[PDB]
């Protein structure tokens, strides 16, 4: 009996969010997709025949990577009042990956609901349409909802990578910088690295086609499939190990004599002319970022969407929410 | 300067093996693909316009999963003398994954070369066409070419899984058995589990379509997309953790009240009504299996195809080969 979970349903509507892996959801009048990560689009394919509401970047990926039929894809602009089945909704930048959004639902009866999808809370969100009215219910990405989860800011990670890469290529003009990636994400990191080095980013034709879906301005002048004309390469995450990088260095035919690689997980692992830096890159809120966003939003009700498998996890999170509400006075 | 490595070239011919990620390989007259693993087919797509020689199962996957054009796919039968560009070749079962083959090349000048692709050496190979003549050069999958690498036989792993599953469902008829999988592989494990339980294997429509490509006899009577009509489910490897399995148990709506899961890596990790067994499943030769195969084949020359990134690794392997040759007297 495949059952869609509670945290994927929008109360007072027939709306679901990221609920494509349960077959036909009874009484669902509109299916939203917050972003193009396989955990969330799972189940979508060329055989799907209900309307999918999503951002334009997400729509491009649905069309070109999953071959969802164009007639069922309903892309919506960001930061704009839109209507779906008589209900007003706004898509907000989730600061997660390209095309990723939070969804703000304005119920005709006056209730206002935010579904964050996956997000990394940011002070800029306090400047968004969220500011213009009271938000009653919050469906919250609680991936790192525990005080242990501390990591640097996105800008700190990018600054570290820029500095490390610039210095390494300064000391050795024959060095190659490698960034590991999945299908999307990390664009701001590897584009900044290539920028400081005055280089395009080299990659496979498949990764190149993927980046064409992302509406990045002037993208063709930033990326190339001609690998050996660049100083920065993208490789699959699973190749970022000494064996995989030695192999890539051999594959480049002597054009480079050293690789410096970054991967998400600071002192590098070094074996000869290969070095690997694990960087604390994250597409989700830290505990403190999350706490700040929630104390600013002051929702009446919070529904966690992640780590809700046991009672202990759910109740520990409810405890933090009560403490937050007490300290901020709502 | 993208360069195809030496271990992917067949000497005395214009043949390459699993060399699709280097653009046009200069002077390559025929491209072989040993099996459908992304490390090996990497680079293949609908835009490829040279002939690809492979098994029929691999050909099905190329056509239906990668949309390689049918006119460039050249499937060949197993255990059968075939001709490619005037050269006689045989495809042999590699005992690796469905459709995976080793390739035996019969050069017009009398030289005989075996490329194992990925393989798990088996005594049955000693009964193959390999027996009928002397093999001069061996391009060897050396994934676990180190004495530390010991693990049970495939039959021992399958027997353990059958027994554990049968006993768990005997003690609790409401339990669910889960097997984690990538795109292909492990069929003999999860089909045997379902067999002993008198059940079909439930799975997503995507995994169902994949298994239809594998020429498994009577397959439609062994698998289903109607999950809750079965006792054995397949999930993505990355979902095989307590959070992912708790979530799946919720998704099944109370049909089951317990999950017992197997994954490749014996005492289970248990948290309440979820248990996870790491099983030492392998699609590659153990050190001892490899040693036995090579001492039986007695090749004049061995060329390792894996772990050849450093001199230390290459020379350590050459040392084992010399010791093997000395002990067996060739
Ligand atoms: Zn995500
Ligand atoms: Zn393989």
Author numbering:
A (entry chain A), B (entry chain A): 698 to 962, 976 to 1040
Structure paper excerpt:
Structures of SNM1A were solved in two different crystal forms at resolutions of 2.16 and 2.19 Å; the structures are virtually identical, except that crystal form B is lacking two N-terminal amino acids present in form A (RMS difference of 0.57 Å). Structures of SNM1A in two different crystal forms show only a single zinc ion. Comparison with SNM1B shows that all residues involved in zinc coordination are conserved; all are in the correct positions, except for D736 which is a different side-chain rotamer. However, it is likely that the active form of SNM1A also depends on the presence of two zinc ions, as demonstrated by the complete dependence on an aspartate (D736) for nuclease activity that should coordinate the missing zinc. When looking from the direction of the active site, SNM1A is predominantly positive, while SNM1B is only moderately so. Remarkably, the reverse side of both proteins is predominantly negative. The electropositive surface regions in SNM1A, identified with Roman numerals in Figure 1C, can probably be attributed to the following residues and structural features: (I) residues K1022, R1024, K1029, R1032 and the dipole of the last α-helix of SNM1A, which is non-helical in SNM1B; (II) residues R697, K698 and K699; (III) residues K743, H744 and K760; and (IV) K940, K947, K948 in the β-CASP domain. In SNM1B it is well ordered and makes hydrogen bonds (via T257 and S258) to the second tartrate molecule. This segment of the chain is partly disordered in the SNM1A crystal structures; it is possible that the ordered conformation is stabilized by, or dependent upon, the presence of the ligand. A striking difference between SNM1A and SNM1B is that while both are similar in overall structure, they differ markedly in their charge distribution, with SNM1A having a very pronounced area of positive potential surrounding the active site.
